[PDB]
Symmetry: D2
Subunit: 486 residues, 4 copies
Amino acid sequence: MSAYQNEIKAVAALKEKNGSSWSAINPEYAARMRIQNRFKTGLDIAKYTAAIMRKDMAEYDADSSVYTQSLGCWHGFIGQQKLISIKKHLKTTNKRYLYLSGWMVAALRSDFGPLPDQSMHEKTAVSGLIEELYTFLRQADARELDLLFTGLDAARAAGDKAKEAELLAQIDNFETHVVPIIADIDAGFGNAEATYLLAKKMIEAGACCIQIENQVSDEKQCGHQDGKVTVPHIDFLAKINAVRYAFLELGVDDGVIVARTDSLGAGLTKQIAVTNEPGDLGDLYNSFLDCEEISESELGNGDVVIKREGKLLRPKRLASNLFQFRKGTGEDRCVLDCITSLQNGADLLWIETEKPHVGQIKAMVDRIREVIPNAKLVYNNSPSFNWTLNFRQQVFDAFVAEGKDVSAYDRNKLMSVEYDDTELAKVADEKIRTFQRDGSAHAGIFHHLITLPTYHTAALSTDNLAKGYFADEGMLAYVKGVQRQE
Amino acid sequence: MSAYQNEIKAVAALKEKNGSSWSAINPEYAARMRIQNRFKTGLDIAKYTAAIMRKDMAEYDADSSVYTQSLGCWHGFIGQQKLISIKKHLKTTNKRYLYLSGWMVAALRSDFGPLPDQSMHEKTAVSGLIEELYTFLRQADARELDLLFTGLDAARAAGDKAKEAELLAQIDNFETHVVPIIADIDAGFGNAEATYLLAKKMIEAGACCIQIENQVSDEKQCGHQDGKVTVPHIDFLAKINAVRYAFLELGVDDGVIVARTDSLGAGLTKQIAVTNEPGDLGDLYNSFLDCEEISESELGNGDVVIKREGKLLRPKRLASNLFQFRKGTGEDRCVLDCITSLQNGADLLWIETEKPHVGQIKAMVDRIREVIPNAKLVYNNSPSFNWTLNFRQQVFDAFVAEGKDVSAYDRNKLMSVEYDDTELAKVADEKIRTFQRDGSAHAGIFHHLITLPTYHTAALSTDNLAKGYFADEGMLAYVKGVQRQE
Amino acid sequence: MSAYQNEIKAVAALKEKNGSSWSAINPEYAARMRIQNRFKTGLDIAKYTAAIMRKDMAEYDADSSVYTQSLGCWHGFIGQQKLISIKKHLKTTNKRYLYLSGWMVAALRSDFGPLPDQSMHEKTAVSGLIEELYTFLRQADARELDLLFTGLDAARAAGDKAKEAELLAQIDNFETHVVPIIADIDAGFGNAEATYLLAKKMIEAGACCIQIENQVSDEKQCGHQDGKVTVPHIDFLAKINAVRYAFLELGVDDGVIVARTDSLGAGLTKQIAVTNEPGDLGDLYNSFLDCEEISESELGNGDVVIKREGKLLRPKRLASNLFQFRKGTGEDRCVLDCITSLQNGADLLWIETEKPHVGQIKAMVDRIREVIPNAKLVYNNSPSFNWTLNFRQQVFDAFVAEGKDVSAYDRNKLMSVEYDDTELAKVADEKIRTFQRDGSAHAGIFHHLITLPTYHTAALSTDNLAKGYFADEGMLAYVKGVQRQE
Amino acid sequence: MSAYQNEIKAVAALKEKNGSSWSAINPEYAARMRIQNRFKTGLDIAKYTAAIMRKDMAEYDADSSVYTQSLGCWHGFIGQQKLISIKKHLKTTNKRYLYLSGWMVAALRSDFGPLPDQSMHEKTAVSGLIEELYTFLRQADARELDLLFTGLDAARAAGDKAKEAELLAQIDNFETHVVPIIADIDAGFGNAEATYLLAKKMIEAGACCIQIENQVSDEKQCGHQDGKVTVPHIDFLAKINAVRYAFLELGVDDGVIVARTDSLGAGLTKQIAVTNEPGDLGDLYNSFLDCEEISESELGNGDVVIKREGKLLRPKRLASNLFQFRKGTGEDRCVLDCITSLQNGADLLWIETEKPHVGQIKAMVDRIREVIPNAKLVYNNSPSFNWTLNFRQQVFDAFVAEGKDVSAYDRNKLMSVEYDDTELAKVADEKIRTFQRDGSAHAGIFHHLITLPTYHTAALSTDNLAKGYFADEGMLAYVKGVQRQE
Ligand SMILES: [Ca+2]
Ligand SMILES: [Ca+2]
Ligand SMILES: [Ca+2]
Ligand SMILES: [Ca+2]
């Protein structure tokens, strides 16, 4: 028997048990409400979506062409219209997820108004947006099912048996708009206990996947090129553990943790790591510090020094009480971070990079996979990269191997108003088009997202309408720009 | 002295008064924060914007070409990007307002998820959105002023006196993003006391203008063409009075009330109005009831009858306990509604119509203005009208006067895939382009809005990106669709 | 195996399945978190508590001495301390519920500040308080279980096997603080669809029982003694049905609906009920109208008249457009209301009375039970009754039967500073003490509550401390008044 | 002219200006609404209350008997009933403030449910409670004024001119329930920018006084007796500056900053302070570190050492990466903290102590006042001190000076069931009663508060009712315990 039939039977039995006092209750109508509300709680969503993500991860492991994608959405309505569009044009939700952007929560969803991306807003805005996204996806299910039940009644009123049968099949095979979300928790908005508390609220809202990072965003030195600040592994691993316990408490056994490393762009640290024996994680972290040998006499009062390899050394230290890593150690620290995360409870990796470059990320993933062979990445196709410059430049240098042409193209004015229609341009655009496929084939990327794309699409579409409506076009700007497209 | 200078002086004096304990306080830095926060409370916004709207109403009275416009915005970020676009392209905020759409609050901003437009959501979502819109507009001011103060410091560091002087002038003449809002309160979300309470919260959030309606939206009969339900004038006038007292309590002497009538599409009423003498408002309302003379013997048990003009008559009554107005009385009731509103405390009118038709609205406004000569309308350029059909049809019939052509155009397939490039089409589009101007010149329209335009622009722009990104275009859909435009 | 053991086994198996990457996860620690979070969602609470209430209703049906009690609580902390006190002193939660007072939500929990009890506040404050109450009860469970697991670890560290065994038994037999709540939804905060929407949110928050009323609180005439306003049964029954569908959609098959009638104190109605044949519910409702025969000539213009029993009659009508019921029909209308509710989907009754009087309520319940023999009441032991006056007066008149004494007691100054120690006083206090038992034995009362008792206890306890602390007692007022008691 | 008269005149003039369309507006009624809403925004409250606190601080400086008091309140209703009680019994609000307890926000007001006092909850709960407290105080004003205007109308209806005149005087001299609040911001819930953002929201809600602390509450080692963790002065001073800029931006020139030091119970620090020359604040902070001289050969790999007074020393360091201060340096660090705070922008001090002991606090204040002679304290009369033990013990040892008795009293069983009626007990209670007066006379205490007293009073009063109501007393527990007192 179908889910719909089973629910009609179930409500009819309650009606019978309760007798004539329930005479006004219509069992088929109640059944439709039940079918229209498949996911009654956020934890039901979290368990359902966790299983989907685990299946997708296994299918990617078997075939690197079968990867997953998402766009960051800053409101339930934006997520809803994205999933409606996916179903309309692409016919299945399979391999499409939501992304919860901490940047967009800070920029758009705080009671404080727009804030920078430093975990300064009220942390309930994060869990609030997850719940909102799933409320809107569940309502999209309910509306489409209601339309199907309306057509079912119309088929019945016309005695059309074939159409009734096709609609009942569409109802039984209905594809929910509810999909997995990768939810950004920043660094947990506090210590490990605070991380657990927030993760728990995010999972109760429906999240099957939590992304957590090893940086201290509120200590960035904007005046330094690599001004981000990392914590020792023990601090970050404790937060991974806190997120795991939130999943476990709630019964989401399959919950997914994405460990993000910011080490590539982080030249600083607040702490010197505790170390108990040489070669352990504390010692490895401290090994990257930029030190100098200063005689005990040449040392300033209050200077801080560390014993490394039998000598007392002075790590370079800013006025802000931050210590510096040696230049050029970003990649090495990322690889250590990532291996350590997968060895200690993370499920997926995120390496924050400064440009979209398949070879660069492949190099790091190859080093990681010589230790953890199926290590999988979530990759931010960042909206703050200038994709055209990066890729025309990338295709320029790919020429220089046997690129005859080279001299015909400057390399400094490549991004231009008009280098269009050139081979470098059509090829650059093709490399952009295949970037995700190529990174998933060669650099272990399981999931491709853009963090804040719908910030820009909402701004642009508002500007494009306002620009006409308030000026000579008046209502024609709306009719042409909006009404004619839909 | 400029506002900026005055604030530097003011903070320097406090620093001096407090002595060396305030040595770390930088008076110019504090002054910039004060300049960046011109509107410290919502009531400061409400008073500032009320004066703007009153000025605009006076300028429209003197010159019908000088009208005002707004688009409905469903989030602070959408309102913010609209005002940023206005300033970028059109160089002034003058004559541009915000509109708070009750439909979009119901559809998008409730803790219940999407709801129909029946005042069923939590009413604090309405005031919450007003505050959010003004938080985002105030932040846009702060960000642009911060950029100007940054350029001021750079001019000073370069010893560039002319540029320093130009920037100080740009700071002193800065045009705020804060503009008036026309805020939809539906029918007040309750009785007159409840209306006052909500209005007060909306005005405290910054609203200088409240739009209130005479319908009972939660009693619509969707099964009737003119299924809306009105209340007797005494009920509606009490709510106008409640809104006035909220403005007065808060000191917003100049607050604006828009009285919306739904009578054109309302064929029903729940109440029979109390009347004390013939010809008063109660009697006029009841005069429009659709009655029939039934002998006391021919009357059903429990039937309800009214004495009109010396006879007992039975008003037509639905099973839902609603009474029917005579067909064709919509316009007459609208004119009575509107005259009554302006005679009893409203400032502006809104006549809800079923199509964008200048002659139709002019006819009603002419009747109103023979009593109230400067009566002014707020006109919803409704997004649910098919603008192309309506206006090609309107231009078809404008031909038929001496429109030779007529026979060359069907009138039933006018809206078409390809009647484009015809004279009827180019002319229809021109009529759309000039619709607002023409209605403001001929039909007393002070303000033109669209209620839910940014619902559609957000949906469309999300669909247009998703359609490519998740299919073969991948990142090229974002680079082309988004990054290349901005 | 115990729940605790089963959860340790379950987490150990996941740890084994996942391998050394989960080495830091402690299965017993995770198991404790699971035991400490028995009720992971509000719907789990609603189903658990609904079964308790159904069991209690059956046990009351078998034995009228086994009734249930609650106190209204206005904050999660108040509910929590009530349940902690119950467990400490009375050793079981059995037969004790929570009550959610709509009056206290209006007075205390609105974003508007204190409001009168007219459903004018934001309706999400109602569901919000249910969730808060259950959050605090769940946290009380977690804290007490954490203390038991701490003692378990201490027993183990001391090698005390008997104590370890007793603590494991206390953990396996732990009695949750989570109990049923009777949740006031007023009249649904809107129409039937709105009622469904709010009920659904209240049930998702944990409520197994919803109390809904047939009055229109925002139309009370405070200037009339019996100034409340009722709706026809069809309107109220539609709202009962809406609440049932919310329970059914959510899978809370056992959900309980309390139908409250306000007819005893309601002399008015806004509507004249639709009636299709004599004797139906519409006709019965209209039968109670106070009408007068006026000749068609003697009738005012616009007067409204109804055909009852072959004649045209004019129901008495206020300027407010409300119709009057005949005096002395309150009880008859209550009995009709109640029978109708139980015949059409309600589970329990609430008859709002003007004084605590067992005989008065028994009279109505006897009439109801001659139709519905097991009809059960929820009875508000109202805090706005003067219990001492009512009951000394009640005991005075119980004397007058063969009460010799009568002359020794005035009857007008009975409530007095000093009629204490009299037989009338000690007996009046005893009648108060046994009031609930007696009403449950003789008047069908399944549940006794007080609506807003913790409003008064919080006010009193704050006043009693402030009165001393800020005056000569200083810190001694706190030490004596607070610290010495606990 | 009175405020009331002036407002009647003001509204009558608007009515006249607007003409007959405002005929329904009653100017006296509107005037009453204005009088009933004296404080239209939180910033109006903050400026009004800041001036009160500054006046009180000056009056305390002139006379140490004129000090101020508050009780922590966890809900607007609790604060409201406290101020109502003050006005009823003590006839003026003068010298009584509110206290906003961060502990009670964590324990009671978070969306997460009860949390420990570690700034882990959503920070908007803090500002939310300030706004709620002032909403309830403003409503208490409105209700009492409404009662006075009702009596005014009754006097007029009786032609009683003397009573009309007395009521108008009571209206013109009405004492608002709105008083200053000392608002706990913990350590700012983040860095200095985050502190500013939250302070701004708290001041906009009405707070004229912000209390900020130098500890890192989320790093406490509960396993250490003095397990709190401090930050170097530069970090704390930056947060003082952030709070000052919030006051200044908002125009609250008179805003008060309370700098709380936790150094007395803090034996740890996460950071070693940056120092530029000997004797500066960084060097002074580091001077308190507990170091040991270890030969470069005897040092572990990765050990951290500091140069102090020409030698390399190893500060004691926990596995948690925290450094230890020398035992017995708590008082010295408190005195440095406090002097530094008043020298760098704080207005008042708070020294967190472990027992209520006038001599102990006087000792520290004397050291502070030899540098800052009018330094003033806010003193927490902590509810977690056992006041009876501490003070019977204090009075026991005050005997031992020439206390003959000594031998008659043990000193270990002093707190007892029955040492009552002894001279030590009556004297201990008298010392408790005069503790605040004595500390204000001898130890510079301007303000005495209890942090979480209404947590306990609400728990106790709920338990005391539940204990009877649910057991044999039934309704008599409410009538006796509640109804008879009020
Ligand atoms: Ca992030
Ligand atoms: Ca509306
Ligand atoms: Ca109620
Ligand atoms: Ca604190």
